[PDB]
Amino acid sequence: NGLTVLPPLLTDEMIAQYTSALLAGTITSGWTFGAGP
Amino acid sequence: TRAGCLIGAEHVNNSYECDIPIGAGICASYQSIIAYTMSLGAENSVAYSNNSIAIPTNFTISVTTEILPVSMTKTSVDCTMYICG
Amino acid sequence: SALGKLQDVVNQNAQALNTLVKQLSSNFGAISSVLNDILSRLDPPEAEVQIDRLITGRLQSLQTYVTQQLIRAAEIRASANLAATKMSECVLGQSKRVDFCGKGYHLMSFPQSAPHGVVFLHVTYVPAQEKNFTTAPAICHDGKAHFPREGVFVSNGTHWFVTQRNFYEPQIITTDNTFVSGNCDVVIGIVNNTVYDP
Amino acid sequence: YTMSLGAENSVAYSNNSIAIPTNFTISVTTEILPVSMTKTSVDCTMYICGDSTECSNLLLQYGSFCTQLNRALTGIAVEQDKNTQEVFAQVKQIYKTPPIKDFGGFNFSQILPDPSKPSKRSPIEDLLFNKVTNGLTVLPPLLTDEMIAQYTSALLAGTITSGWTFGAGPALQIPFPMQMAYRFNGIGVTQNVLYENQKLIANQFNSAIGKIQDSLSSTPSALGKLQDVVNQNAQALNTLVKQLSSNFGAISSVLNDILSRLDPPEAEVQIDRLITGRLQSLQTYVTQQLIRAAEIRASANLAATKMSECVLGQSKRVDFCGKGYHLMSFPQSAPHGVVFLHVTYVPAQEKNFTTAPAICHDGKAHFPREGVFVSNGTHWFVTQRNFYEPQIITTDNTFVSGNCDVVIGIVNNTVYDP
Amino acid sequence: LTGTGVLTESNKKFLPFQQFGRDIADTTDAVRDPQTLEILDITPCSFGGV
Numbered sequence: 001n002g003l004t005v006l007p008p009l010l011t012d013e014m015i016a017q018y019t020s021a022l023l024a025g026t027i028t029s030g031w032t033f034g035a036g037p
Numbered sequence: 038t039r040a041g042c043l044i045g046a047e048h049v050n051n052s053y054e055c056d057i058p059i060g061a062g063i064c065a066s067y068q069s070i071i072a073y074t075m076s077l078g079a080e081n082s083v084a085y086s087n088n089s090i091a092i093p094t095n096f097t098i099s100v101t102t103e104i105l106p107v108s109m110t111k112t113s114v115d116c117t118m119y120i121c122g
Numbered sequence: 123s124a125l126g127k128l129q130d131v132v133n134q135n136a137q138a139l140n141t142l143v144k145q146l147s148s149n150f151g152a153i154s155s156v157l158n159d160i161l162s163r164l165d166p167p168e169a170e171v172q173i174d175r176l177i178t179g180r181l182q183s184l185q186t187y188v189t190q191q192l193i194r195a196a197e198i199r200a201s202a203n204l205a206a207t208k209m210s211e212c213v214l215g216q217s218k219r220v221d222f223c224g225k226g227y228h229l230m231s232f233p234q235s236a237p238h239g240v241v242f243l244h245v246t247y248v249p250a251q252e253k254n255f256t257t258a259p260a261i262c263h264d265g266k267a268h269f270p271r272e273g274v275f276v277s278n279g280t281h282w283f284v285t286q287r288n289f290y291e292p293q294i295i296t297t298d299n300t301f302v303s304g305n306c307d308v309v310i311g312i313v314n315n316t317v318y319d320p
Numbered sequence: 321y322t323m324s325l326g327a328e329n330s331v332a333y334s335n336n337s338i339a340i341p342t343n344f345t346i347s348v349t350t351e352i353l354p355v356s357m358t359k360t361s362v363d364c365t366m367y368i369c370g371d372s373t374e375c376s377n378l379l380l381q382y383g384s385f386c387t388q389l390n391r392a393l394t395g396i397a398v399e400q401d402k403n404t405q406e407v408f409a410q411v412k413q414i415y416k417t418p419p420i421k422d423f424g425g426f427n428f429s430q431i432l433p434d435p436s437k438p439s440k441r442s443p444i445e446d447l448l449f450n451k452v453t454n455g456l457t458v459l460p461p462l463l464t465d466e467m468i469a470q471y472t473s474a475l476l477a478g479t480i481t482s483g484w485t486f487g488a489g490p491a492l493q494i495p496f497p498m499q500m501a502y503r504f505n506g507i508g509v510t511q512n513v514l515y516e517n518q519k520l521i522a523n524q525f526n527s528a529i530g531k532i533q534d535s536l537s538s539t540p541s542a543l544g545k546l547q548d549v550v551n552q553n554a555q556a557l558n559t560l561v562k563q564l565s566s567n568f569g570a571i572s573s574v575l576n577d578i579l580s581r582l583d584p585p586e587a588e589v590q591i592d593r594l595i596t597g598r599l600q601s602l603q604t605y606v607t608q609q610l611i612r613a614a615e616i617r618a619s620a621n622l623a624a625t626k627m628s629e630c631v632l633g634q635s636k637r638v639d640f641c642g643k644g645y646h647l648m649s650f651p652q653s654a655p656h657g658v659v660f661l662h663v664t665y666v667p668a669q670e671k672n673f674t675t676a677p678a679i680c681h682d683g684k685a686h687f688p689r690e691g692v693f694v695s696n697g698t699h700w701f702v703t704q705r706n707f708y709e710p711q712i713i714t715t716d717n718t719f720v721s722g723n724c725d726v727v728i729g730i731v732n733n734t735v736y737d738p
Numbered sequence: 739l740t741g742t743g744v745l746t747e748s749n750k751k752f753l754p755f756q757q758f759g760r761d762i763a764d765t766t767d768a769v770r771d772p773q774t775l776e777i778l779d780i781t782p783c784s785f786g787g788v
């Protein structure tokens with residue numbers, strides 16, 4: 001009746017990839033990746 | 038109660054954590070339905086004196102969860118189709 | 123009920139959609155809630171009035187739905203700004219802010235994706251198995267007052283030591299872990315103990 | 321007039337002069353934050369229609385508008401209790417102060433609960449509670465004022481007897497002149513400064529607490545932030561009451577007059593006009609109540625952040641917990657609000673000194689380990705940055721890096737060796 | 739009963755006093771053909787946001 005659900009721009013696997021990148025950064029590099037290289 | 042009259046709950050003198058809030062310090066729980074004044078917390082008297090200190094000798098690595106919502110479902114409504122079809 | 127915060131948002135959005143769909147079944151004072159029935163039963167001079175009643179009712183319902191959707195969007199935006207702050211300060215660094223990144227002394231944090239949400243696993247340090255000690259603000263030695271550089275003077279009953287504040291690690295009170303400021307006449311509660319010199 | 325922004329203060333800047341404080345003021349400031357509102361509930365059916373069954377039969381044609389209004393008001397009502405729970409119930413242990421109030425000269429009688437009062441409030445909290453003055457129901461708050469005062473008493477006992485340790489785990493007791501020294505070291509001032517001047521700091525703290533009580537007792541507009549919330553809620557309820565006296569184009573604002581003066585074919589039209597007018601009024605009231613509930617929730621989240629970061633710990637954030645270098649904070653309950661007494665350190669009685677970045681000695685550059693090189697005109701010393709305490713420049717308070725050819729502005733002075 | 743839609747064979751079994759079926763929004767989602775007594779679902783014709 002005119003209602004639509006727009007899909008999100010980031011899918012769940014890409015959000016999971018972002019969280020995996022954050023986990024890899026904070027495990028292998030500490031807080032250094034959040035402030036530079 | 039200060040919230041009003043409560044019929045069907047047995048008032049007890051013990052204090053528990055709030056399960057179903059009634060109001061004005063009254064809470065209800067199921068164990069029959071009981072009503073009670075809620076307990077803010079367990080009592081604890083800190084052993085203060087002017088020349089004594091407490092130093093930890095051990096530690097616990099504690100991991101806790103924090104859940105935070107980020108987005109909602111993106112809903113769009115065709116206004117002309119919703120009103121008129 | 124661990125994930126109740128996300129399920130609350132999902133239930134509120136689904137209930138708002140269900141209410142908006144349910145509002146089409148109301149006639150709002152017209153003869154019928156179906157537009158085709160009015161258009162097949164009535165001439166346009168009175169069908170215009172019935173359709174006008176249906177239009178103003180459905181428009182009021184839609185404006186109401188958009189109003190609480192904007193209010194919930196503001197609430198979710200505030201929660202998402204909080205989540206971005208927690209991601210910046212607890213995951214990408216170590217935070218000195220108390221109870222911002224869990225209960226206890228915050229060590230580090232892990233982000234986890236969740237349906238329309240984020241879950242932070244806060245790894246924190248909790249002190250445990252505390253023990254009483256007799257403490258003093260300063261040590262009087264050779265007419266001089268000695269204060270700890272980073273720790274605290276403790277005594278187990280007969281002997282005086284200096285330890286770090288958040289963990290019991292007794293060390294001999296030396297000139298290397300203490301500093302000298304003034305005499306013993308000023309500090310209230312100064313005690314007499316020797317200070318070793320390496 | 322054209323308004324002025326403040327007094328012009330040309331700071332005496334030069335490339336080799338510094339200003340070092342020689343004294344301090346223990347300053348206590350008040351911060352008032354609203355936490356919750358009055359929990360209001362509206363019977364939508366009785367507000368639109370009262371006891372008229374024909375009005376409710378016509379109101380059923382509009383569907384579930386009343387259900388949405390009741391659910392929105394119920395959400396606001398439980399949100400207020402959630403706000404109070406997040407602000408005040410940050411500890412699950414109810415701490416008490418010891419019966420002997422020996423805190424090294426520090427007086428907390430104006431903020432600790434008074435045993436002589438039946439409400440078990442502090443004198444400051446008692447003054448704060450004295451300074452705040454058709455289908456409609458007011459739901460009582462879930463936490464009474466006595467239990468909010470009990471929560472603030474537990475927080476005060478924890479932060480007095482145990483430091484910030486109770487906010488991070490078990491409450492570890494510590495003497496208050498030691499807790500204070502730890503707070504002094506958190507803002508970068510050495511423990512000795514606190515210990516040597518402990519009587520003066522205790523006297524300044526007691527004088528500031530008394531000035532806080534006098535300023536609250538002498539200013540009528542001190543608690544205006546809570547009073548604005550109370551006045552807005554009462555005025556919105558009064559407007560919602562006064563909207564019932566309007567006919568909205570009908571022949572009368574009373575449903576009984578229409579039902580007694582007219583037949584149902586035209587009374588249906590007049591009642592429909594009254595229904596849509598009162599429904600529009602109720603939707604307007606619920607919308608502005610939701611907006612104000614969002615504002616109060618934001619203020620309560622801020623208040624919970626200040627409770628966690630200023631009371632349960634020492635905060636490095638500038639101006640988050642008062643003006644100046646934050647030492648500690650004390651919570652006080654207020655009617656639908658919280659009052660934080662921020663105890664801060666303000667530097668005072670500053671003095672000019674001639675300063676240098678490094679000391680050249682034996683072809684080596686010496687830099688201060690924790691302080692700064694100062695000179696009174698003839699002799700060079702090293703002192704801590706936030707308080708003037710001159711010490712002899714030794715190898716124990718300096719470190720060596722490079723020669724004297726690199727650092728711009730290095731001066732020649734001896735460096736003593738113990 | 740006028741409308742616009744796609745008529746499909748239905749698995750719903752109407753009682754003999756029933757002629758049509760309504761959904762949540764009180765639109766006719768199922769109808770009995772008055773000549774051959776069979777039930778038909780009425781799906782709305784496909785609408786897609788552009």
Ligand SMILES: *[C@@H]1O[C@H](CO)[C@@H](O[C@@H]2O[C@H](CO)[C@@H](O)[C@H](O)[C@H]2NC(C)=O)[C@H](O)[C@H]1NC(C)=O
Binds near residue numbers: 084085252254
């Ligand atoms: C440190 O010493 C104090 C005082 O001796 C201890 O506090 C007492 O503990 C006993 C046992 O729980 C209680 O019965 C007393 O009422 C407490 N006294 C006070 C004044 O609180 C405290 O337990 C000791 N700390 C540790 C870790 O043993």
Ligand SMILES: *[C@@H]1O[C@H](CO)[C@@H](O[C@@H]2O[C@H](CO)[C@@H](O)[C@H](O)[C@H]2NC(C)=O)[C@H](O)[C@H]1NC(C)=O
Binds near residue numbers: 095096097
């Ligand atoms: C500090 O606490 C840890 C536990 O958090 C203690 O480790 C336990 O030691 C006992 C006896 O040695 C073992 O039976 C347990 O299995 C150990 N637990 C774990 C998780 O390894 C440790 O002994 C404590 N140390 C002190 C000095 O008290």
Ligand SMILES: *[C@@H]1O[C@H](CO)[C@@H](O[C@@H]2O[C@H](CO)[C@@H](O)[C@H](O)[C@H]2NC(C)=O)[C@H](O)[C@H]1NC(C)=O
Binds near residue numbers: 278279280281
């Ligand atoms: C406080 O701690 C000190 C050091 O740990 C203890 O001194 C030692 O005690 C043991 C056991 O009697 C002796 O074998 C050592 O020779 C002591 N060392 C020195 C340098 O004297 C002391 O006994 C402890 N006091 C209490 C009351 O437990």
Ligand SMILES: *[C@@H]1O[C@H](CO)[C@@H](O[C@@H]2O[C@H](CO)[C@@H](O)[C@H](O)[C@H]2NC(C)=O)[C@H](O)[C@H]1NC(C)=O
Binds near residue numbers: 262314
């Ligand atoms: C700590 O040591 C100081 C100095 O050794 C003691 O001060 C002396 O006290 C005696 C008697 O109380 C006096 O006759 C001396 O004149 C004091 N000396 C000085 C330099 O003032 C002090 O009493 C000692 N304290 C303890 C608790 O043993």
Ligand SMILES: *[C@@H]1O[C@H](CO)[C@@H](O[C@@H]2O[C@H](CO)[C@@H](O)[C@H](O)[C@H]2NC(C)=O)[C@H](O)[C@H]1NC(C)=O
Binds near residue numbers: 339670
């Ligand atoms: C440090 O020295 C400077 C310069 O000698 C002082 O600045 C002067 O202060 C007086 C008194 O307010 C003014 O009349 C001058 O105009 C100021 N000069 C400049 C260049 O700003 C400063 O007051 C001294 N600091 C202290 C704490 O006495």
Ligand SMILES: *[C@@H]1O[C@H](CO)[C@@H](O[C@@H]2O[C@H](CO)[C@@H](O)[C@H](O)[C@H]2NC(C)=O)[C@H](O)[C@H]1NC(C)=O
Binds near residue numbers: 342343344345523669
């Ligand atoms: C630092 O400031 C304090 C005030 O905050 C000074 O204490 C005052 O000293 C004067 C003169 O000695 C007395 O008349 C006052 O009664 C004192 N006030 C208090 C509250 O004790 C102190 O003298 C200052 N010290 C320095 C070195 O400037």
Ligand SMILES: *[C@@H]1O[C@H](CO)[C@@H](O[C@@H]2O[C@H](CO)[C@@H](O)[C@H](O)[C@H]2NC(C)=O)[C@H](O)[C@H]1NC(C)=O
Binds near residue numbers: 427428430530
């Ligand atoms: C702590 O502060 C309170 C209040 O500032 C002091 O109580 C005052 O005591 C004096 C002398 O005994 C009386 O003249 C005042 O009327 C009291 N004021 C109040 C409000 O009761 C108290 O003496 C201070 N010290 C201690 C140790 O409690």
Ligand SMILES: *[C@@H]1O[C@H](CO)[C@@H](O[C@@H]2O[C@H](CO)[C@@H](O)[C@H](O)[C@H]2NC(C)=O)[C@H](O)[C@H]1NC(C)=O
Binds near residue numbers: 696698
């Ligand atoms: C700068 O401070 C130093 C030390 O505080 C002062 O040196 C002392 O000055 C007094 C007064 O003339 C003498 O009695 C001492 O013998 C000096 N001590 C030493 C070690 O020489 C110095 O005078 C101060 N300079 C100024 C300009 O005030």
Ligand SMILES: *[C@@H]1O[C@H](CO)[C@@H](O[C@@H]2O[C@H](CO)[C@@H](O)[C@H](O)[C@H]2NC(C)=O)[C@H](O)[C@H]1NC(C)=O
Binds near residue numbers: 680732
């Ligand atoms: C600080 O000391 C250095 C070395 O002791 C001085 O540098 C000397 O300056 C004289 C005259 O300019 C030269 O003849 C020497 O060759 C320099 N020696 C070195 C090692 O560079 C410097 O002038 C002194 N600074 C001040 C302000 O007196």
Ligand SMILES: *[C@@H]1O[C@H](CO)[C@@H](O)[C@H](O)[C@H]1NC(C)=O
Binds near residue numbers: 087088310311422424
């Ligand atoms: C601590 O209190 C005792 C009495 O309870 C007293 O004798 C002692 O001097 C006090 N010490 C300090 C540092 O206040």
Ligand SMILES: *[C@@H]1O[C@H](CO)[C@@H](O)[C@H](O)[C@H]1NC(C)=O
Binds near residue numbers: 335336728729
């Ligand atoms: C500071 O400025 C003066 C001139 O105003 C100059 O002679 C001196 O070398 C400068 N010092 C530094 C460290 O820049």
Ligand SMILES: *[C@@H]1O[C@H](CO)[C@@H](O)[C@H](O)[C@H]1NC(C)=O
Binds near residue numbers: 772773774
């Ligand atoms: C005519 O309609 C009746 C019921 O309305 C039905 O039983 C019969 O089969 C129909 N006949 C034809 C030829 O459509």
